[PDB]
Amino acid sequence: MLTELEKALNSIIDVYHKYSLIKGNFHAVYRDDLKKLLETESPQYIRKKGADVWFKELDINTDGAVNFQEFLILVIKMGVAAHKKSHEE
């Protein structure tokens, strides 16, 4: 059996595929898919940047999609921000 930390990492994979498997390329989250990901999975202080602002930041190769590596950029930034907020209370 995997540990709780290891389960959390595999669960992050599953979270991404809930949106990447909606349509098109299996490992591509398009702009409208990213909007739903942000609205469902991220807290308000992350959503407040705007889905279009996040999408432009994450689509590194400007191909109109966010792949899994680019999604991990969002995960890293969400984690650093969540740690910082927990480190202020």
């Binding site: 709780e4 959390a8 990492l9 979270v15 595929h17 991990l72 984690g79 650093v80 480190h87």
Partner: protein, 108 residues
Amino acid sequence: KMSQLERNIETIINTFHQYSVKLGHPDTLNQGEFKELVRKDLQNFLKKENKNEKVIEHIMEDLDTNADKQLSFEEFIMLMARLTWASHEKMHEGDEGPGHHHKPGLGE
């Protein structure tokens, strides 16, 4: 309430804090604390690496971007992203399709 993604990130933060905490206050992971986290909570994802203590120490050195023999959470979370990426790559190792399917990931 928290989303699935928020809970996963919370698990990462709390696991980091369980080994870094110093006199009840948040801190950084030294090499000894990093090895204990890796030995226990990454015993499957880093099963082979855990057999070579020098390999674990060099992973620490590679992540120690601040060159202070300590892993802040910012330094540590890069390992979490790499292992998440590596586990997904394991799910698609030698994939021929068609369609999308995940084989077992890291440590399985």
